């Protein structure tokens, strides 16, 4: 299991060290073959105006693989099997302090780039790292970066209703066992997430009181009866009269294409179980299990 | 000479040469050949030595140990051996411990009730005298179960291979992934009858090659009080049938949940269950029922262990 | 319909159209056949006794 | 009584025992060579099939 | 290496015109049932659930399609069907067939669905030997979703009626195609719609403030390419629930929250096992997949 990537160019003694530091890190590679070029590694297809989901999507069809030997004339790297064991070590940046006994996950970067990316001039291809977080901290520290962008554009426009005093005290505050981390923002990754949860956002109080209506028979399922005593009042006066036939089916053909493509980029499997860990020689063994 | 013995013995458990067939020179292709051939057609008759030439091709996966060390208190020395592990990873200690928790040692966390489990809470108490050593340990045994977040701590880990118990520190050895080999036998994973509750009993489906088992983790209220209750399902329906199947399981609990929350309504208070994967048993190996001083103990046979997130069902 | 020589040699073979099963409490319809040893002469003669 | 009959039909079984008779030379046999081939390998078992 | 190999003993000698169809269908992915290697007909393709006397039950057949071991169709004889099977994680060939006919790359996902758009070009009968052979189709996931989308819109307005442009038809890029929805039983199909009515009047009590706003400074302001299907005209609900203010720490929760009950909806949204495509040739219709169960 070894990829060589050649480099018809020598490197610099600045691009040398800068790659003596990610000895192991976990990469994404376009093919599964050895014979590839330095523009074939990372994600530079797809970040070098970067959007989300065509990047978390792109993970899970891709074939990752682990940095071992940095040599001045080129490169050699490890492809992952499914369900193999390794021995990966923490580098990447920003710091997050993995535990041992945990379920790393793999998130497309979406901080500042001089923590992303090495910037390379040897060649003139810029090579782009993913975000190794682990999987319950990668989850909590996007469901308040997709807030944060979502208030960065209301106080855009009406910038009268959001507090920045504590716009920025919860927002950028991430607490992941027993340590608080400050993340640091400047979001052209989030949007369109801030896009697919807001076209979603209106069409769930359309969308159940058009199906809980519907579903009303002698065979009913028992427990719909008790999740109706959830809904708010307000949601039970819409009247559904105010528009078409026709035009109720595209809220629905559109509505429930939302909840799937919104649901099926959270439930996305390149992620992998570390069993052992050391916190001062940040080296991990794990096992990596796709989907 | 006994230098000269496990020469014989390494020498009679290395894997079998590959073929070098010279495809460049004439007469050197055709005695390669014709040893391809001598050779399959002795691994095909059903003598005894073609048999005794089957078993050297060994295409096995290793199972992964992981090593534990508990204090003495969170965890018995009876404890079955085959029993299934859990990691509770709350904080960061000040030394290198760890809190692991075995189905009967977090029914005293849980502190369900003994009109569903009658026989592993006889054994819960005998083992914990009083249930304060694991309580002591864990500060919020009351707003992880109201948030309903106890469920994004455990992290599934294997059935027990080893248990060193000393006065202090207990050093126990888990097979997170492959059949866990002893420490020589192959252990298999034991749950008590108590809580495996099985799907694919009924009044033809298909004999697929795999079947699994899940754990189920669920918020709920006694007392007035927050507490939860697992349990264990086995089934091969494929995960969108056992989700909804759950679902009817816990048809009499989200009644008598939502009888309260009609009253006042938080938001830390609609997450209800998670469903783990915790590893595949293959198909018709029945588990055959042990006792232990009697505890109906279901011990199966070739469990490999998986992992699989904790995904909410309501 | 087909004649009575393709019937023959179709006779002991097939399994007729959905005969019952051995040995329940109800009396299903058979499926699979695997060791169903059944010989139904009512469905080709079309009578009842 | 209602003003219509009606016709009643049932299915019963019977075990029965069997003769068979098959006359002299009706079918040629031919019979091949056995080979054993594995088709499911474990912790615990290799299972073989004849 | 391990033996892996199911092998379909006839019965009965098979005709000359359906054995043209068998073998038309050569390298087609059909669930047969028991992982053993001696195998009737009867066990061997999905019509044990998908009849012809009842009314076939699409969900019930696709919720039967991910309990079956998968096999791989590789020779059609007059006397027996021999087919290779699927293990969990083996490089296995796979060849493209089926009559609505979809183009395949590289890094693609597949799925195996049930005939939807017609029952009767998947089914082939055997009237030599009393059996009809039906087949499943495999379908990538941009459109294998696409097919559990428009079902489930039937399932519901069908209901609210007892209209066959909307309801009906599947929108493929530049394409549109008609299910096969006439004479189905819809018990299950409802089944999953009854758990859908748990979810969205969950997701319907926790929506954020902040994102109900953004579509009101959005959906009259400004042009974005997938806004328009809402006109200048608000949701008369939208502003009955902007009428309190803003607050991040209720809305944090309000994020999380909604965050974990669209991880449950993967288990109303699935689809049968995968088939992660890493080649294929388009001028043999030869990919070669990987596959993977649940």
């Keep these: 299991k070894s990829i060589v990537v050649n ?63 940095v040599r001045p004339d080129s490169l050699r790297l490890t492809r992952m099997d499914p369900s193999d064991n390794l021995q990966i070590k923490n580098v990447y940046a920003p710091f997050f302090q993995w535990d041992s006994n945990t379920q790393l996950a793999v998130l ?44 960065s554009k209301i106080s855009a426009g009406a910038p009268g209703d959001v507090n920045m005093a504590e716009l920025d005290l919860y927002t950028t505050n991430v607490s992941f ?44 399922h028992p427990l719909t009866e008790v999740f109706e005593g959830v809904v708010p009042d307000e ?38 179980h570390v069993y052992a860990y050391s916190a001062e020689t940040l080296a991990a063994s794990c096992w990596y299990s796709p989907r | 000479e006994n230098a000269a ?38 691994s095909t008759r059903p003598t005894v030595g073609s048999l005794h030439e089957a078993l050297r091709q060994a295409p096995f996966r290793q199972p992964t140990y992981g090593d534990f060390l508990v204090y003495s208190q969170t965890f018995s020395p009876q404890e079955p051996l085959g029993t299934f592990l859990f990691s509770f990873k709350q904080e960061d200690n000040g030394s290198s411990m760890d809190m692991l928790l075995t189905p009967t040692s977090l029914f005293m966390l849980s502190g369900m009730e003994a009109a569903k489990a009658p026989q592993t809470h006889k054994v819960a108490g005998v083992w914990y005298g009083s249930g304060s050593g694991l309580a002591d340990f864990i500060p919020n045994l009351s707003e992880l179960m109201d948030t309903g977040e106890f469920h994004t701590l455990l992290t599934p880990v294997g059935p027990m291979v080893q248990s ?75 995960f ?75 | 319909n087909r004649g009575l020589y393709t019937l023959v040699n179709e006779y002991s073979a097939r399994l007729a159209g959905a005969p019952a099963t051995s040995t329940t409490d109800l009396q299903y319809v058979v499926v699979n056949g695997t060791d169903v040893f059944l010989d139904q002469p009512c469905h080709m003669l079309q009578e009842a006794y | 009584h209602p003003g219509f009959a009606m016709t009643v039909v049932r299915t019963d079984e019977v075990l029965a025992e069997h003769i068979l008779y098959c006359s002299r ?26």
């Design chain 1, 7 to 69: 480099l018809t160019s020598r490197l610099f003694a600045d691009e040398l060290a800068a790659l003596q530091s990610k000895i192991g890190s976990v990469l994404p590679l376009g093919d599964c073959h050895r014979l590839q070029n330095i523009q074939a590694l990372g994600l530079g297809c797809v970040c070098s105006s970067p959007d989300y989901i065509q990047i978390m999507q792109y993970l899970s069809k891709c074939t990752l693989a682990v940095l071992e030997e």
């Design chain 1, 108 to 151: 497309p970067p979406l901080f500042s780039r001089k923590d992303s990316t090495i910037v390379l001039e040897s060649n003139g291809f810029d090579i782009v790292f993913p975000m190794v977080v682990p999987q319950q901290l990668g989850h909590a520290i996007l469901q308040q970066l997709l807030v944060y962008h979502i208030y």
């Design chain 1, 177 to 220: 066992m027993g340590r608080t981390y400050r993340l640091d923002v400047d979001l052209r990754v989030l949007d369109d997430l801030s896009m697919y949860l807001c076209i979603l956002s209106a069409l769930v109080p359309r969308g159940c009181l058009r199906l809980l209506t519907a579903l009303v028979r002698h065979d009913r």
């Design chain 1, 235 to 272: 949601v039970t006066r819409i009247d559904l009269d105010q528009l078409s036939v026709p035009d109720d089916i595209t809220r629905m053909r559109v509505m429930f294409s939302y909840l799937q493509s919104l649901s099926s980029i959270f439930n996305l499997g390149p992620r992998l």
């Design chain 2, 5 to 42: 013995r496990l020469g014989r013995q390494v020498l009679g458990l290395l894997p079998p040469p590959t073929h070098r067939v010279s495809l460049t020179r004439g007469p050197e292709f055709a005695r390669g050949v014709r040893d391809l051939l001598s050779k399959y057609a002795a």
């Design chain 2, 164 to 238: 060193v118990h000393s006065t202090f520190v207990t050093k126990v050895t888990s097979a997170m992934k492959g059949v866990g080999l002893a420490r020589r036998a192959h252990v298999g994973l034991t749950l008590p009858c108590d809580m495996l509750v099985d799907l694919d009993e009924s009044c033809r489906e298909p004999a697929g090659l795999n079947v699994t088992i899940y754990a189920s983790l669920v918020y709920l209220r006694v007392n007035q009080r927050p507490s939860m209750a697992l349990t264990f399902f086995q089934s091969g329906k494929g």
């Design chain 2, 240 to 314: 969108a049938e056992v989700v909804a199947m759950i679902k009817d399981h816990f048809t009499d609990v989200i009644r008598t949940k939502y009888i309260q929350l009609r009253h006042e309504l938080y938001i830390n208070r609609l997450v209800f269950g998670a469903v783990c994967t915790l590893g595949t048993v293959p198909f018709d190996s029945h588990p055959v029922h042990q006792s232990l001083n009697s505890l109906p103990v279901l011990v199966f046979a070739n469990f490999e262990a998986a992992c699989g997130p904790w995904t909410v069902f309501l």
């Design chain 4, 25 to 50: 030379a009706s079918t040629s046999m031919f019979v091949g060579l056995p080979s054993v081939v594995r088709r499911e390998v474990r912790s615990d078992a290799v299972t073989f099939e004849i």
